[PDB]
Design an enzyme around this catalytic site. Structure first.
Site, PDB file in Angstrom:
ATOM      1  CE1 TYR A 254      29.423  15.055  28.842  1.00 49.66           C
ATOM      2  CE2 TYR A 254      29.054  13.238  30.399  1.00 49.66           C
ATOM      3  CZ  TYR A 254      29.595  13.734  29.216  1.00 49.66           C
ATOM      4  OH  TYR A 254      30.296  12.882  28.396  1.00 49.66           O
TER       5      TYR A 254
ATOM      6  CE1 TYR B 235      29.987  13.278  34.393  1.00 52.67           C
ATOM      7  CE2 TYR B 235      27.749  12.719  35.067  1.00 52.67           C
ATOM      8  CZ  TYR B 235      28.757  13.628  34.927  1.00 52.67           C
ATOM      9  OH  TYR B 235      28.556  14.916  35.323  1.00 52.67           O
TER      10      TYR B 235
HETATM   11  N1  LIG Z   1      34.692  19.682  32.896  1.00 50.86           N
HETATM   12  C1  LIG Z   1      33.915  19.214  31.938  1.00 50.86           C
HETATM   13  O1  LIG Z   1      34.335  18.711  30.904  1.00 50.86           O
HETATM   14  C2  LIG Z   1      32.335  19.336  32.118  1.00 50.86           C
HETATM   15  C3  LIG Z   1      31.455  18.873  31.124  1.00 50.86           C
HETATM   16  C4  LIG Z   1      30.091  19.042  31.463  1.00 50.86           C
HETATM   17  C5  LIG Z   1      29.668  19.596  32.643  1.00 50.86           C
HETATM   18  N2  LIG Z   1      30.601  19.989  33.508  1.00 50.86           N
HETATM   19  C6  LIG Z   1      30.043  20.569  34.777  1.00 50.86           C
HETATM   20  O2  LIG Z   1      30.601  21.826  34.925  1.00 50.86           O
HETATM   21  C7  LIG Z   1      30.611  22.241  36.410  1.00 50.86           C
HETATM   22  C8  LIG Z   1      31.977  22.684  36.640  1.00 50.86           C
HETATM   23  O3  LIG Z   1      32.910  21.557  36.518  1.00 50.86           O
HETATM   24  P1  LIG Z   1      34.465  21.726  36.013  1.00 50.86           P
HETATM   25  O4  LIG Z   1      34.783  20.652  35.096  1.00 50.86           O
HETATM   26  O5  LIG Z   1      34.612  23.156  35.654  1.00 50.86           O
HETATM   27  O6  LIG Z   1      35.362  21.396  37.404  1.00 50.86           O
HETATM   28  P2  LIG Z   1      35.836  22.234  38.623  1.00 50.86           P
HETATM   29  O7  LIG Z   1      36.510  21.321  39.641  1.00 50.86           O
HETATM   30  O8  LIG Z   1      36.507  23.461  38.075  1.00 50.86           O
HETATM   31  O9  LIG Z   1      34.431  22.621  39.149  1.00 50.86           O
HETATM   32  C9  LIG Z   1      33.752  21.879  40.234  1.00 50.86           C
HETATM   33  C10 LIG Z   1      33.784  22.746  41.357  1.00 50.86           C
HETATM   34  O10 LIG Z   1      32.910  22.285  42.424  1.00 50.86           O
HETATM   35  C11 LIG Z   1      33.468  22.771  43.570  1.00 50.86           C
HETATM   36  N3  LIG Z   1      32.899  22.051  44.591  1.00 50.86           N
HETATM   37  C12 LIG Z   1      32.893  20.695  44.840  1.00 50.86           C
HETATM   38  N4  LIG Z   1      32.245  20.346  45.926  1.00 50.86           N
HETATM   39  C13 LIG Z   1      31.758  21.500  46.443  1.00 50.86           C
HETATM   40  C14 LIG Z   1      30.977  21.750  47.659  1.00 50.86           C
HETATM   41  N5  LIG Z   1      30.538  20.841  48.479  1.00 50.86           N
HETATM   42  N6  LIG Z   1      30.730  23.072  47.855  1.00 50.86           N
HETATM   43  C15 LIG Z   1      31.115  24.079  47.088  1.00 50.86           C
HETATM   44  N7  LIG Z   1      31.876  23.900  45.936  1.00 50.86           N
HETATM   45  C16 LIG Z   1      32.175  22.565  45.639  1.00 50.86           C
HETATM   46  C17 LIG Z   1      34.968  22.553  43.511  1.00 50.86           C
HETATM   47  O11 LIG Z   1      35.678  23.185  44.473  1.00 50.86           O
HETATM   48  C18 LIG Z   1      35.162  22.971  42.073  1.00 50.86           C
HETATM   49  O12 LIG Z   1      35.508  24.418  41.934  1.00 50.86           O
HETATM   50  C19 LIG Z   1      30.126  20.871  37.078  1.00 50.86           C
HETATM   51  O13 LIG Z   1      28.801  21.080  37.328  1.00 50.86           O
HETATM   52  C20 LIG Z   1      30.388  19.771  36.034  1.00 50.86           C
HETATM   53  O14 LIG Z   1      29.567  18.674  36.177  1.00 50.86           O
HETATM   54  C21 LIG Z   1      32.002  19.888  33.320  1.00 50.86           C
HETATM   55  O1  LIG Z   2      30.165  16.706  34.753  1.00 51.74           O
HETATM   56  C1  LIG Z   2      31.324  16.485  34.159  1.00 51.74           C
HETATM   57  C2  LIG Z   2      31.366  15.945  32.929  1.00 51.74           C
HETATM   58  C3  LIG Z   2      32.595  15.755  32.355  1.00 51.74           C
HETATM   59 CL1  LIG Z   2      32.643  15.101  30.727  1.00 51.74          CL
HETATM   60  C4  LIG Z   2      33.811  16.061  32.981  1.00 51.74           C
HETATM   61  C5  LIG Z   2      33.745  16.581  34.220  1.00 51.74           C
HETATM   62  C6  LIG Z   2      32.539  16.796  34.811  1.00 51.74           C
HETATM   63  O2  LIG Z   2      32.467  17.345  36.045  1.00 51.74           O
HETATM   64  C7  LIG Z   2      32.474  16.517  37.170  1.00 51.74           C
HETATM   65  C8  LIG Z   2      32.189  15.180  37.117  1.00 51.74           C
HETATM   66  C9  LIG Z   2      32.191  14.404  38.284  1.00 51.74           C
HETATM   67  C10 LIG Z   2      32.499  15.019  39.506  1.00 51.74           C
HETATM   68 CL2  LIG Z   2      32.537  14.075  40.944  1.00 51.74          CL
HETATM   69  C11 LIG Z   2      32.792  16.386  39.574  1.00 51.74           C
HETATM   70  C12 LIG Z   2      32.774  17.118  38.416  1.00 51.74           C
HETATM   71 CL3  LIG Z   2      33.133  18.826  38.516  1.00 51.74          CL
END
Ligand SMILES: NC(=O)c1ccc[n+]([C@@H]2O[C@H](COP(=O)([O-])OP(=O)(O)OC[C@H]3O[C@@H](n4cnc5c(N)ncnc54)[C@H](O)[C@@H]3O)[C@@H](O)[C@H]2O)c1
Ligand SMILES: Oc1cc(Cl)ccc1Oc1ccc(Cl)cc1Cl
Ligand SMILES: NC(=O)c1ccc[n+]([C@@H]2O[C@H](COP(=O)([O-])OP(=O)(O)OC[C@H]3O[C@@H](n4cnc5c(N)ncnc54)[C@H](O)[C@@H]3O)[C@@H](O)[C@H]2O)c1
Ligand SMILES: NC(=O)c1ccc[n+]([C@@H]2O[C@H](COP(=O)([O-])OP(=O)(O)OC[C@H]3O[C@@H](n4cnc5c(N)ncnc54)[C@H](O)[C@@H]3O)[C@@H](O)[C@H]2O)c1
Ligand SMILES: NC(=O)c1ccc[n+]([C@@H]2O[C@H](COP(=O)([O-])OP(=O)(O)OC[C@H]3O[C@@H](n4cnc5c(N)ncnc54)[C@H](O)[C@@H]3O)[C@@H](O)[C@H]2O)c1
Ligand SMILES: Oc1cc(Cl)ccc1Oc1ccc(Cl)cc1Cl
Ligand SMILES: Oc1cc(Cl)ccc1Oc1ccc(Cl)cc1Cl
Ligand SMILES: Oc1cc(Cl)ccc1Oc1ccc(Cl)cc1Cl
Lengths: 297, 297, 297, 297
Positions: free
Chosen positions: C178, C188
């Site tokens: 991100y 963040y």
């Molecule tokens: N959601 C967003 O808008 C967004 C934007 C940019 C990047 N991301 C990135 O995308 C990835 C997925 O995030 P998401 O938003 O889909 O949320 P999500 O909660 O679906 O994904 C995070 C996952 O991490 C897993 N997790 C946490 N701690 C863990 C551990 N110790 N061991 C194994 N699994 C663990 C959780 O169980 C969960 O399935 C992350 O890397 C996040 O930073 C999300």
């Molecule tokens: O990276 C992210 C970025 C955005 Cl905009 C929204 C969710 C995101 O995902 C996370 C952010 C912080 C923590 Cl603790 C865990 C996760 Cl999965």
């Protein structure tokens, strides 16, 4: 005990037509550090500039920290869109302004400085021009776009190329750019964004060419919008001043000396290990990922 | 007429253990600009440092342009991997070195400076450490990687966070990074590349947090390899010195003062519009797209 | 005539605990391209996940373009903060959740996949965790920061390192990052920005290490905020969805498949010349230089 | 189950004069995905191209994975340095080549496509030209530099601007750039580096203008040197192929389809969340911080 010492150095500053822009500020800074100042003034502006300077109109603007006033050793007419005499259209040659002065092509100005002083140590480019700047790129003509590039990017290549022979090794040049080259800034149109991107890329390339050729350092400063806030922000620059003030990591305006001081450092021997660089002097705006003033927050 | 004036300012420099690194050079520069110098020395190194300093072993290294010698107002023992006393393992507490001195956790050193001087204007972070630095990332352990991050990136967050309360607004901090954070540099292993990337990202984030909170500027210098060329380049740093010399836009070595001078400028009021920035003081290497010494050319 | 063909390929997706995140979307995409899907589910979430999956709770979410439903060949419990059994504190070992399952350390999960399938072609990391994410960096503790790094950055190094031996050459991995790593995004916190910067830098370094070692490509996708707009944006993600919608070069929301589709392309043979890259799948937000919704405009 | 489906879409590819460049490869890729292919051929090259195509000279190069041969629906003469008829000098008008065909200015070609097909979905720019490319910037003339910019950067603005009215919303364009815009590559002279920097900056700006105006995505691919290694690398491209092979994160050559495949993905609906981007399809070279073949190592 740590002075930015430019004593015994000579600087040619291209792009000063009044005391309100960055060009004037860089000159002031270099003059405070001890440099001998030569100025390149755009032909059509030459008259009012020299006259106001003569009537003491810029005196308050010439005051150095020292308390003394800045001295401009010599003003040279110049039109950086023309490299040599044969490049000028009689159409231009014949205009009264261009008619009233001479030796204003880049090749000519460089020969005059050589004849007059023999050498320089610092080259400052502080000029830009773009006839279609108010148009979006989708509406900019080929001529308008090439005109912006010719006056705002190639003019730097030409000045450096023509002055290189008289620049003492260990010397330096600096130009001013703006973030529209790397990020989308609606309103900075007519290929000016394109020109700033070319100028920054050329800065790198010329750091290698001039660096290996004559030990000359080449850098550019990506500056923020200059000035204090308007009573009513209207116009591209006014709104940008307000936006930066509200949104930068540190809330404050940007004053010309802030840029002039950075430039003075960059062209000094203290900056000996810095070349081909883009230095941001913009209150850290460029680093922000979101506007803090967006209504969503 | 344009001095980098730090007179009346006080700087705390974390990471000086001898006169051969960048930390010493920054201190010299700030001392030349007029700052009062406080030093943070890593506990295990404290003894030999203070002793050599006392025997006049660093005297030639203390000579300022001025001709006078640099004065270190006070040396503080410090271990930037520990924030507070309760964080230290008796295992460590019990080691003779840590045993021989006190008040070395970040929280403690900060309280001592407060008690001793009340405030500071400049914070310089010039330290790093990584136990598995010679291993590729694929072979680095979780502990090794976190150790590099803890000593080389979080230590900056901790120092700034603990000193912020005693930093006078308009003050500044500076850290040293390296290009391995942004480009692949084989040999800079053990998560040190990872740590430098975190430090640079934190520099930006902290410019916003500290900028809005106390008008403190935060920047980092991405420095080139320090030293002159080896008779026979062997070892990571020797080879890098030679590579940079052959391949930079300007062929020359990098001396510590070159970095110290840039830092002095960056923490001065002259740099008032610069914050959250990564400034390259590396002879312009980072800008090159190919090695000029590749045998293909 | 130009299909993203993953038939005969096997993917291990780390980080799926429900059908609402990016992990689920990438799995769907790879399953649509023909890959055999293995999933790594965080221990504490394992139960509700497997149960909902069993009760057909995710059936509507499993529908492929094809009309058929996605098949998850096997769910593996996993806790990516622990590399090997000896690394787990009895404190954790003893928790009911961790108590109820086994073989969940990275080293163990990798051996189980080896035993169960022998090899994989694609590694997808879609996980992150940071206990102090709501705190500014100036208020984040050393433990909180290292925890974010350990779960969000080093976990990738560990998974790749442990699975590398069973990855067929010509295979690929992909992680999600991100923009907070490169630009300031207030909110963040807790070192999550720091962790994303380390993950992106490691992506580059590992592209070289794994690339030269086994012909494995390594890239990361910098994704935008996922979801449609809230009736009333409150909370970090809701506000970011609205901000991006108003401010991106193209006004639209971002759906999970948009990221899943890019990932599917990136891990396919069609992407054979792409490695060590950060691909933005964020409606072009990252390129904007100002928020169009700032009240100054 | 995950096809890059361009069936029912129409693409206009500017810059195909033979089957050895990237233009041909992108066309092949789009044709494999199902698109209807229209080609823009530079006037002076028109004859040999159409003739070789007719004699079946490119048949082996037209073979699709499918086994079938690529069909070029129509070849349009074009000279992207001229926007409208009144822009052409009789000097040019009178040359036999330009003499032999018509409707080749950008405005004319666009009207012919409108008349012939009414609309297009994809615009591919794969052209460049620079008369002084072998000269260092310090030796490049103003005319040479502006010529490079006019044919290699503004030509994209013109094509997009003239075709925008007939592009169906949800459509896309793609151009090809090269790293010399961002890093120093000795030998890529005559302002070509400058032109690539302008093209990349315009890509961003146009993603906003065209994105908000018609929901058109705009991206550029920064490609590596095309071809396999020479028996004896001599010439700019041969040496670069060898350098990249030795120095990229993954050691392999780059084939045209590798770029064509990335382009096909980028202009498809699968890439719906990607715009204003610079995608590197260069074996990850750009990420390297040092040449592994430098003799110092
Ligand atoms: N959601 C967003 O808008 C967004 C934007 C940019 C990047 N991301 C990135 O995308 C990835 C997925 O995030 P998401 O938003 O889909 O949320 P999500 O909660 O679906 O994904 C995070 C996952 O991490 C897993 N997790 C946490 N701690 C863990 C551990 N110790 N061991 C194994 N699994 C663990 C959780 O169980 C969960 O399935 C992350 O890397 C996040 O930073 C999300
Ligand atoms: O990276 C992210 C970025 C955005 Cl905009 C929204 C969710 C995101 O995902 C996370 C952010 C912080 C923590 Cl603790 C865990 C996760 Cl999965
Ligand atoms: N003003 C700002 O807020 C800001 C922000 C970023 C960058 N800059 C850059 O700073 C430099 C100085 O701009 P400024 O704002 O100080 O305005 P300015 O008008 O003071 O400077 C531009 C100068 O260019 C000169 N000039 C124009 N065409 C010329 C030609 N053909 N030949 C010779 N001289 C010519 C003008 O006479 C004028 O002195 C420019 O490069 C500009 O892009 C300004
Ligand atoms: N030396 C180079 O060529 C170069 C190039 C780029 C960046 N740098 C950076 O410059 C900074 C200074 O490095 P240097 O090369 O001058 O070496 P150095 O050994 O002089 O500096 C590192 C310092 O860190 C201190 N230190 C280590 N662990 C510590 C801990 N736990 N607590 C407190 N202090 C600790 C050491 O005692 C030492 O003084 C580092 O951040 C390094 O990454 C150095
Ligand atoms: N070849 C490489 O290794 C490489 C690497 C990076 C980028 N590129 C870029 O890829 C694109 C394609 O280059 P290529 O290497 O495939 O070579 P190419 O010669 O196949 O492509 C260049 C094309 O431009 C056309 N052209 C030149 N002037 C024109 C004009 N005025 N009007 C219309 N058409 C004109 C030529 O006829 C030719 O078909 C260029 O943009 C180039 O910079 C090539
Ligand atoms: O580059 C600039 C950026 C800003 Cl924010 C304000 C002024 C600038 O300077 C110019 C912009 C366009 C033209 Cl035509 C001429 C000049 Cl001097
Ligand atoms: O960052 C550096 C970069 C270079 Cl080229 C040389 C030395 C550097 O400094 C360090 C590197 C690794 C560790 Cl463990 C400690 C330090 Cl002080
Ligand atoms: O951009 C390029 C980059 C490389 Cl490595 C090789 C060829 C390239 O393409 C060109 C370069 C210069 C000119 Cl005049 C025309 C073209 Cl087509």
């Amino acid at each position: 005990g740590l002075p930015i010492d430019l004593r015994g150095k000579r600087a040619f500053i291209a792009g000063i037509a009044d005391d309100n822009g960055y060009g004037w500020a860089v000159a002031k800074s270099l003059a405070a550090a001890g440099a001998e100042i030569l100025v390149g003034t755009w032909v059509p502006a030459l008259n009012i500039f020299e006259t106001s300077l003569r009537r003491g109109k810029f005196d308050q603007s010439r005051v150095l920290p020292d308390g003394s006033l800045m001295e401009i050793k010599k003003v040279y007419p110049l039109d950086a869109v023309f490299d040599n005499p044969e490049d000028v259209p009689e159409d231009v040659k014949a205009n009264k302004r261009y008619a009233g002065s001479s030796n204003w092509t880049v090749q000519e100005a460089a020969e005059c400085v050589r004849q007059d002083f023999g050498s320089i140590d610092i080259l400052v480019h502080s000029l830009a021009n773009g006839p279609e700047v108010s148009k979006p790129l989708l509406e900019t003509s080929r001529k308008g776009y090439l005109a912006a590039i010719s006056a705002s990017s190639y003019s730097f290549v030409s000045l450096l190329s023509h002055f290189l022979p008289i620049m003492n090794p260990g010397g330096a040049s600096i130009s001013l750019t703006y973030i529209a080259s790397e990020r989308i800034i609606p309103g900075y149109g007519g290929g000016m964004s394109s020109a700033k991107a070319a100028l920054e890329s050329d800065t790198r390339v010329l750091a290698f060419e001039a660096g290996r050729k004559q030990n000359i350092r080449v850098n550019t400063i990506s500056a923020g919008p200059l000035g204090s806030r308007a009573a009513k922000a209207i116009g591209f620059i006014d709104t940008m001043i307000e936006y930066s003030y509200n949104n930068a990591p540190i809330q404050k305006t940007l004053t010309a000396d802030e840029v002039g001081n950075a430039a003075a450092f960059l062209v000094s021997p203290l900056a000996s290990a810095i070349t081909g660089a883009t230095i941001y002097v913009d209150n850290g705006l460029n680093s922000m990922g979101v506007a803090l003033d967006s209504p969503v927050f």
